[PDB]
Enzyme design. Structure first.
Site, PDB file in Angstrom:
ATOM      1  N   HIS A  91       0.956  -1.115  -0.062  1.00 46.78           N
ATOM      2  CA  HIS A  91      -0.087  -0.010  -0.036  1.00 46.78           C
ATOM      3  C   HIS A  91       0.775   1.180  -0.080  1.00 46.78           C
ATOM      4  O   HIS A  91       2.279   0.933   0.266  1.00 46.78           O
ATOM      5  CB  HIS A  91      -0.991   0.003   0.964  1.00 46.78           C
ATOM      6  CG  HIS A  91      -0.070   0.206   2.507  1.00 46.78           C
ATOM      7  ND1 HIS A  91       0.556  -0.995   3.033  1.00 46.78           N
ATOM      8  CD2 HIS A  91       0.374   1.044   3.249  1.00 46.78           C
ATOM      9  CE1 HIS A  91       1.103  -0.899   4.223  1.00 46.78           C
ATOM     10  NE2 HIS A  91       1.120   0.524   4.267  1.00 46.78           N
ATOM     11  N   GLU A 103       6.198   8.876   5.009  1.00 45.51           N
ATOM     12  CA  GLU A 103       6.106   8.579   6.553  1.00 45.51           C
ATOM     13  C   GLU A 103       7.643   8.719   6.953  1.00 45.51           C
ATOM     14  O   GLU A 103       7.815   9.324   7.738  1.00 45.51           O
ATOM     15  CB  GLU A 103       5.428   7.393   6.776  1.00 45.51           C
ATOM     16  CG  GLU A 103       3.981   7.143   6.403  1.00 45.51           C
ATOM     17  CD  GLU A 103       3.261   6.134   7.108  1.00 45.51           C
ATOM     18  OE1 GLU A 103       3.848   5.004   7.219  1.00 45.51           O
ATOM     19  OE2 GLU A 103       2.221   6.329   7.779  1.00 45.51           O
ATOM     20  N   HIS A 116       4.980   0.746   0.788  1.00 44.68           N
ATOM     21  CA  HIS A 116       5.288  -0.338   1.804  1.00 44.68           C
ATOM     22  C   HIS A 116       4.684  -1.517   1.245  1.00 44.68           C
ATOM     23  O   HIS A 116       3.714  -1.751   1.054  1.00 44.68           O
ATOM     24  CB  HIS A 116       4.366   0.004   3.032  1.00 44.68           C
ATOM     25  CG  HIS A 116       4.999   1.213   3.846  1.00 44.68           C
ATOM     26  ND1 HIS A 116       4.338   2.007   4.681  1.00 44.68           N
ATOM     27  CD2 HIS A 116       6.197   1.929   3.664  1.00 44.68           C
ATOM     28  CE1 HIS A 116       4.846   2.624   5.254  1.00 44.68           C
ATOM     29  NE2 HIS A 116       5.986   2.923   4.471  1.00 44.68           N
ATOM     30  N   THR A 196       0.493   1.888  11.523  1.00 49.83           N
ATOM     31  CA  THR A 196      -0.875   2.456  11.654  1.00 49.83           C
ATOM     32  C   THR A 196      -1.214   1.506  12.928  1.00 49.83           C
ATOM     33  O   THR A 196      -0.492   0.173  13.285  1.00 49.83           O
ATOM     34  CB  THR A 196      -1.717   1.826  10.572  1.00 49.83           C
ATOM     35  OG1 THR A 196      -1.257   0.548   9.989  1.00 49.83           O
ATOM     36  CG2 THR A 196      -1.757   2.705   9.500  1.00 49.83           C
TER      37      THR A 196
HETATM   38 ZN   LIG Z   1       2.328   1.785   5.503  1.00 48.29          ZN
END
Ligand SMILES: [Zn+2]
EC number: 4.2.1.1
Length: 257
Positions: A91, A103, A116, A196
């Site tokens: 994703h 990120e 990722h 997450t």
């Molecule tokens: Zn990720």
């Protein structure tokens, strides 16, 4: 529940997931001058020739391209890893504008997006068991900058219209993730976490130095996705990234000199 909105974003996650303030959280800023070359790192092995993609899903916080991981097909090994890690999904995280979205950061630089590819350690039998282990996952992170189009990404961008809202999925077979890799496999590595919730500290992060280029048109289509479900007030799926977390007692190692 948790999200990236004004009132449920990363600064709030610790309330439901106290590990958010833990000792090995991700992502982090990669300080290029402080990362040390590590001669002990073995060569990285990305074996995606037999990868079997199955489906693409909007899960309300990103879209996952899911793979058949019931057998050893697409695997990541070598580098800092011991054993074999099986690809389960990839994703992206991206921004509302080109100046943010990644990120991980590099000397505080934010890229427009970050891919990722998530793999789990086959020694633990299944993904659910793997995430409970300090070496359960291997995540390959790849930066995206805006410039020339990435041909291998187009099949992904063209199905997004069909999964605009949370909970929508579509058949997505025969997609070859090798088309998303940069030329060089030079990388940085450090021990970290899911970015997450539940933010589990189970990930060996392998972040490639070389970004891939995608076109403005391509990333524009990421930004047309929705966080919301069908028929609900439209909230564009943008800025679904967690900011850099404290490095604490960790060293980032480089595969290259
Ligand atoms: Zn990720």
């Amino acid at each position: 529940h948790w999200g990236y909105g004004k009132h449920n974003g990363p600064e709030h996650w610790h309330k439901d997931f106290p590990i958010a303030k833990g000792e090995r959280q991700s992502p982090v800023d990669i300080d290029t001058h402080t990362a040390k070359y590590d001669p002990s790192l073995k060569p990285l092995s990305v074996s995606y020739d037999q990868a079997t993609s199955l489906r693409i899903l909007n899960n309300g916080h990103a879209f996952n391209v899911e793979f058949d991981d019931s057998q050893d097909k697409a695997v990541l090994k070598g580098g800092p890893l011991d054993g074999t890690y099986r690809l389960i999904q990839f994703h992206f995280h991206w921004g509302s504008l080109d100046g943010q979205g990644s990120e991980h950061t590099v000397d505080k630089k934010k890229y427009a997006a970050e891919l990722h590819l998530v793999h789990w350690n086959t020694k633990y039998g299944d993904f659910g068991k793997a995430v409970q282990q300090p070496d359960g996952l291997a995540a390959l992170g790849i930066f995206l900058k805006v410039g020339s189009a990435k041909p291998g990404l187009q099949k992904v961008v063209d199905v997004l219209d069909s999964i605009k809202t949370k909970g929508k999925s579509a058949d997505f077979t025969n997609f070859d993730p090798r088309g998303l890799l940069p030329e060089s496999l030079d990388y940085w590595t450090y021990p970290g976490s899911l970015t997450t919730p539940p933010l589990l500290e189970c990930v060996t992060w392998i972040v490639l130095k070389e970004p891939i280029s995608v076109s403005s048109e391509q990333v524009l289509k990421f930004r047309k996705l929705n966080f919301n479900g069908e028929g609900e007030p439209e909230e564009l799926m943008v800025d679904n990234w967690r900011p850099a977390q404290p490095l604490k007692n960790r060293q980032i190692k480089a595969s290259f000199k």
